[model samples]
Target: EAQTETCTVAPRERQNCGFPGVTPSQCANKGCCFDDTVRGVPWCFYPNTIDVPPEEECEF
Candidate 1:
């Protein structure tokens, strides 16, 4: 994905992202920090692109 500080995305994407100790409401573009605390699954910031049903949401 074109994360924050880049093209196809924007600077806020990363700044509004989560690492481990963040809330679901802090993601970019009103996104969410999906599986942020998972041991194996990487913490991700899914943009409004996946605001639809979980099945439609990116399986990050």
Candidate 2:
């Protein structure tokens, strides 16, 4: 599973992580993030990767 800190991306920007009706654990078990509060979007979603940490960015 991924760290919770890595899971907290902008709600509007989250990508679909799993199938509809997926449970929290089911999503997390796949190494994805879960947030059900947002409507009009999938409750389970992929973690943020668009913003790589400054230090973690490619050195070249």
Candidate 3:
């Protein structure tokens, strides 16, 4: 005989993204940040504005 277990999965939450073509700073001023990339899009938030190293940059 074999034993079986049951599990439940929760639904993903959706976010209302702000406007497009707005930079992070500008978005901050607007009280909401906009992301051109859709959900599940990979991203990296760098502390500085300097260009990231080729290896550190996010790649598709």
Candidate 4:
């Protein structure tokens, strides 16, 4: 099975998701993003996590 990064983060923050010299292939498997084109920026960055499903019945 293949892993996936469902969230998108850009023009905000480039959160480092891996160690130095991290390969694109390896970064991908880590379920993160990679962009070496940007200078002085983290090549391997983390993908935003927005998958939170909470179903609860409450009386307020």
The prediction achieving the highest TM-score against the true structure is 2
Q: Which candidate model has the greater TM-score, 2 or 3?
A: 2
- How many angstroms is residue 17 displaced in model 3 relative to the true structure, after the best TM-score fit? 6.9
Worst 10 residues of 1 by lDDT: 2-11
Tell me the number of clashing residue pairs for each predicted model: 0, 0, 0, 0
lDDT agreement with native, every candidate = 0.41, 0.71, 0.34, 0.64
Instruction: For each candidate, give its TM-score against the true structure.
Output: 0.25, 0.54, 0.28, 0.48
Per residue, candidate 3 scores C-alpha lDDT tens digits across 1-60 of: 232321111112223333445456765564443443543521212121223334244658
Higher-lDDT candidate of 2 and 3 = 2
Which candidate do you rate higher for TM-score, 3 or 4? 4
For model 3, give the 10-residue run with minimal summed lDDT. Answer: 5-14
lDDT of 3: 0.34
| Model 1 lDDT tens row, 1-60 | 332331123324433345544445544434554545444333445444322234333656
Residue-wise C-alpha lDDT for candidate 4, range 12-48, written one tens digit per residue: 4768887656668978878676766565666778865
lDDT of 1: 0.41
Ranking of all candidate structures by their lDDT, best first: 2, 4, 1, 3
Sequence-dependent TM-score of model 2: 0.54
Ranking by TM-score: 2, 4, 3, 1
**Best of the two (2, 4) by lDDT:** 2
Model 3, residue 55: distance off in Å is 29
Q: Clashing residue pairs in candidate 4, if any?
A: none
Q: How many backbone clashes are present in model 2? A: 0
Model 4 spans with C-alpha error above 4 angstroms: 1-8, 48-60
lDDT of candidate model 4 versus the reference = 0.64
